[PDB]
Design an enzyme around this catalytic site. Sequence first.
Site, short mmCIF file in Angstrom:
data_model
loop_
_atom_site.label_atom_id
_atom_site.label_comp_id
_atom_site.label_asym_id
_atom_site.label_seq_id
_atom_site.Cartn_x
_atom_site.Cartn_y
_atom_site.Cartn_z
N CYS A 1 21.85 -19.80 -32.63
CA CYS A 1 21.20 -21.09 -32.86
C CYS A 1 20.21 -21.10 -34.05
O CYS A 1 20.13 -22.09 -34.78
CB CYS A 1 20.55 -21.62 -31.59
SG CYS A 1 19.69 -20.36 -30.60
N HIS B 1 16.74 -23.41 -26.80
CA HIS B 1 17.82 -23.75 -27.72
C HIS B 1 17.31 -24.54 -28.93
O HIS B 1 16.29 -25.22 -28.83
CB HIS B 1 18.93 -24.51 -26.98
CG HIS B 1 20.24 -24.53 -27.71
ND1 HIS B 1 20.72 -25.68 -28.29
CD2 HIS B 1 21.12 -23.52 -27.94
CE1 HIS B 1 21.87 -25.35 -28.84
NE2 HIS B 1 22.15 -24.06 -28.66
#
Lengths: 69, 68, 67, 69, 65, 65, 63, 69, 430
Positions: free
Chosen positions: I299, I386
């Site tokens: 990510c 995230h």
Amino acid sequence: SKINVNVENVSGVQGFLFHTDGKSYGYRAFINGVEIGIKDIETVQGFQQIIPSINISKSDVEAIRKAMK
Amino acid sequence: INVNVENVSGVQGFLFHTDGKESYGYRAFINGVEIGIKDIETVQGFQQIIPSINISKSDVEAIRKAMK
Amino acid sequence: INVNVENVSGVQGFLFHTDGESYGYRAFINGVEIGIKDIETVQGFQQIIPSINISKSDVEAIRKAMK
Amino acid sequence: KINVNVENVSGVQGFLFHTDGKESYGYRAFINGVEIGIKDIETVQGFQQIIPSINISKSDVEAIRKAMK
Amino acid sequence: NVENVSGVQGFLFHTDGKESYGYRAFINGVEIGIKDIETVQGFQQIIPSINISKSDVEAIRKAMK
Amino acid sequence: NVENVSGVQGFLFHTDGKESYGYRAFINGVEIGIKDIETVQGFQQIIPSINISKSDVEAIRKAMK
Amino acid sequence: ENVSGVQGFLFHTDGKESYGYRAFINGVEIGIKDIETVQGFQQIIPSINISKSDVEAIRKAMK
Amino acid sequence: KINVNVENVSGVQGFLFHTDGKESYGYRAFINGVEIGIKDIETVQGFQQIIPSINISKSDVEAIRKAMK
Amino acid sequence: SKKYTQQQYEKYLAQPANNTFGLSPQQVADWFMGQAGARPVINSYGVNASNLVSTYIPKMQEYGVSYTLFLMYTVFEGGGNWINHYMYSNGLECLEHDLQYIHGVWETYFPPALSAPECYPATEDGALDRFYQSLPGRTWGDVMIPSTMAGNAWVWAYNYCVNNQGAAPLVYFGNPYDSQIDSLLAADPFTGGSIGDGKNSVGTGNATVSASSEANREKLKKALTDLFNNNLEHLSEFYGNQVLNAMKYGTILKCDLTDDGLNAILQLIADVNLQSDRVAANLANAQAQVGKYIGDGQCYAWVGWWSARVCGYSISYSTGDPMLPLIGDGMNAHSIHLGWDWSIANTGIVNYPVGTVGRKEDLRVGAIWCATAFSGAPFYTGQYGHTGIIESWSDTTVTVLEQNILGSPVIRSTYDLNTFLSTLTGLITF
């Protein structure tokens, strides 16, 4: 929860700068229980960075001397 | 949130005044010595280094014994 | 935010009272016990020293420890 | 401009002590090296705001007395 | 004098290994032996609880005296 | 953590070089030798653990005395 | 009166003539031989720069 | 409610003082109540990291000596 | 210790929560006062006993968490709010965050315990990982099992623990499941299950390279220096100038200042200081990268690649690209605002602490968005959150471009606007 920041002094100077804005004894200062007279503005600006500069009237100066001694 | 600093002024005490009917004006304790303030300039100046608190005229006598 | 100055007031102690028989507002200032007469002095001192609750029965025991 | 105090300035050094076990001595304290007995819950709640309240068993009380004096 | 609020200077010490001396503490330069777990949990709120092996206890005594 | 309440002033010292003296510490101006890793991990929570070479140990002793 | 129980600083020079790494530990002047001790002490005490010519003056003040 | 304490570990209490006027005495300092004269810029830059550098005029230097003693 | 049978432990963890054991009113509240136990939670964040608890219990019921199991777990440990974690105004607010955390754990999968800090892996007597996966959804086991390390080690690896024990390198801990069952009975948690559950996610996120850590204290100093430098308007004052210029002589010596502990202090400092032409050119070039792996495959890499294309500097070393000056954390995706320092180029801000909020107005395409440690609702995050970029949004749904979602690559994913904003911890606009 509530963070506390404890700061320690390093200058080894305990005191304050004193003057009047009315109508004057100029700039004077108490440094480590000793009363001293400032002659130049450079020393005033320099000491203002380490010790506080407060206003004391000429009439009240005599009373502060007895307490600071 | 809060920060704690040292007393770099060499002055230990407080300023005291009354907001009631009978007033003694502004007075302060500087290093265990009681002194009377005459001008407002000295009050505003000392307020920057020492705290200014409210004490009634009736209670002043009791504070003198404790501060001595 | 909220910058505090250490050892400036020159006062070490606390304010004490009871919410139960009442003796009123009393305080210990630098090891000396003093009696407060007006609410103005209470509100003023609360800004420099803490205000705690002590019952009339326990006051006698605190005197011996604070002396 | 107001010069705020920390407080932190109670002038009291010590702690409150009690036991949650079978045999209880109630609430007792140590204030400036002097051992004291607390009678009412109001004094306990009041002092808890300035000094800490800890748990000490009746068997260990004797040992703490020697260290605190 | 002129330190903290609890008025107690020291630490709690114990061993998790084979051969244990239980819970012991140093309170204001004085070594004391704790008998109950209630006193341990109570003191842990004011003073730190550290791990010291039985073999090293003798050396700490000389330094804390 | 509250380290000012521990009543212990000093540090832990060891070497990562060729010749090692293991883990040693200065506790309240007294030099002591640590035998177990449990005491090291325990004291690391209250006092700092620094690196000192075997050659420099002699000089630190004179200053800490 | 302080945690770690060490009061002082580490001092050296970046100029032509060098005295290596030296330190003041609790009012006692000591000479550091290895860089491991320098890196170790830097974690507890500050490392400042002092010229060889000025070292003599600092000794009188630190005594 | 954790507390982060920024305490002076340097074991040095004082300040660096110099003038920006016509007549100059260069860089001088007060370390632990002892007045010392700095010869090189390296020592000035080094000490500035631990102690503050303030401005004091040549005329006022004499008065500061009496207070710092 | 292991005072109970393997079947009993399994039955105790199989209990849904949900299930209050029929002790929902006064009886559970009266036990909480005496078992103290709850003494730090009673004193701090002051609550008016049984009557105030009768106002606290419906909030647990609203969040679908067992009144009995929550009060029992509060007695298990205390403190430092209510359960584990660091700080948070009031007890009722502090309770809500703890319930919100359980929501992001009871449905999210995390690998089982079996010890990790301070050596020696426990040799099992395979069935623990089988039991954790056997448990369906919102069960007490799905909350306990990933959190309690000492419990799983004494139940599924009892043979190893008894033969060892053991100080610092070996087993030093006891059995918290025994302590929980003993206090819960002091309700039947084994007989209740046999005479729940029968119902229906897997965790996301990783950690960046990070050359960390040598000196954490250096990061703490700058965070405090910048806090007073940004709030210089209040000082400009003699005491204020002394507080602003407080950082010169060192050192802030803290022995217990761990990586987790520093981040908690750094995020506390952050929540105090807090309260398009550049993007448009590279946006067309970024949309073509969708479906392809940019990192690293994490990510941070997709975020790093996008930032380097706009501002100049990246987050992940694998994108490389010059690095941003790391001023904090670092490891976790919660957050990147919060370390890295974007004052070097262009920053947003919008730091959302604990609860809540979301702020739909603070969107701005295409900003880097951060998700909470444990989401759970849209992404089902774990430990490290995230991160991705926002492409487009409507007052109903939001389109985002993100990488490592259960094994990458760069995928275009649309989520509920209200559900997505709930996961948010911070945004960084250009």
